[PDB]
Design a protein around this ligand. Sequence first.
Ligand SMILES: O=P(O)(O)OC[C@@H](O)[C@@H](O)[C@@H](O)COP(=O)(O)OC[C@@H](O)[C@@H](O)[C@@H](O)COP(=O)(O)O
Length: 492
Amino acid sequence: MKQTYMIVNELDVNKGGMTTAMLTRSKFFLDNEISGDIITFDFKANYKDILKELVQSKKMDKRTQMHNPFIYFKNISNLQHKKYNYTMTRNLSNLLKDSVEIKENSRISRFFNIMSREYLAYKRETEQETIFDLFKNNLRYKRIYFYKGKIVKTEVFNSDNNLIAEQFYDDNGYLYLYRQINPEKKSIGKTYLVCKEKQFKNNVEFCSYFLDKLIPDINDNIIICDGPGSFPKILKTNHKNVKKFAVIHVNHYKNFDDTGAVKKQEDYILRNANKINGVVMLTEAQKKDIIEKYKITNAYVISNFINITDDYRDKNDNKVVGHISRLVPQKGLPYLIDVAKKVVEQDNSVEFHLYGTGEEKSKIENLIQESNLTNNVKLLGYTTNAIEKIKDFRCVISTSQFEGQGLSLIEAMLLKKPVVAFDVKYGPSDFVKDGKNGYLIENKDIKKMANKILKLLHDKELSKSLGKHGRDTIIDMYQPEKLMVKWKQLFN
Ligand SMILES: O=P(O)(O)OC[C@@H](O)[C@@H](O)[C@@H](O)COP(=O)(O)OC[C@@H](O)[C@@H](O)[C@@H](O)COP(=O)(O)O
């Protein structure tokens, strides 16, 4: 049967967006006898520890594997030697051979050659990590990295101490990879593979070659590009039999813009749409605006699997409005404090709870101070247990000006809760049924959002009845077996 290779630049912990969605997608795929392997392109010396924590935290599937061009070309370079080459290590043992070791503490140390009458290098020693910074006239020109007893990587610097080149070593202590890095532009340039004895113009070229070397061109092996900046590496491949679909996650338009502009990264993925086997997106509304901005015929509509099956008995009848989302501009919290100003104007017993951490903490604190809704509108901060404090809220307001699918609300609905959400660009219009499960209010209409939010708070039954429909509405639209069937229809 057919095997999948999802694509993104990096994978780590504390990443809860694209990564979570890609990793969730893999789980369902394996259950439908299709492999959901990930492809990354960055160098992590400890990439093995990061992958094990994700599996242990039940965020990654044991069956999901990760392909990386540092791991791949190391395992191939490892084959061409038998013994460990301590050449680099001894070259360093030879640079510091006759130098005084000034141990500043248990971690920091400096080497001084009496004959050279100048400090030669610095040593930072920690648990399983030892770094060497080498100098010439008190100017850093090199950095030697050690991890698990062996040299893993060396970094070369210039006069301005800016990174000019990186070198990657295999498990037999040999140079298998190295690249040029533009000093000021901090951009990856001329990449040189050693075991292939090949030269790549940029990282994009190298990674295309890495995909050609990893994914065997065949009708079965399908490539799903999820990372927007990862697409050039997938568009410029030599595969002729391997299928390639792109997925637009967030809203494609340039955020908080009225000029009809589209984010550069996401603009390029849609202009080369023809070259791909199809450009898939979460909402049907985006399939229209995409056939408007790019007149595409390959655009498909498949939603990101909903991993929420929460069933509970809501009895907490308290006048409280909840908004669990990061404090990013796209959430438009300033509208939420306008809605709160009109809500607390009629009913002074209505409390506003905002949960999350981000770039607008001081913006909201000065906004809450204005109008003096201090005890009413409060910030609860980051919380692991979202469901528990959500179960307590009477209703969930979304003042977000743009969104991908409205995951924040799709979750509040699954927690049988009413939702007064602003009609968003590819947002609530897809699930929020005005009067049936919530209140889709036209954007920038505080007054319309306020009176409706008050109506939910002033009707213990209506709010519970609307919310009861909410969970059933989401379960009905977003069905795994048919979502998987939509995926299968693209693969077949
Ligand atoms: O041209 P290159 O030199 O090869 O590299 C420059 C390139 O333009 C960058 O690598 C891209 O910004 C990164 O590409 P991606 O968009 O595929 O990276 C994914 C992104 O970093 C994303 O934020 C990540 O998956 C984790 O997100 P989350 O924490 O929301 O789940």
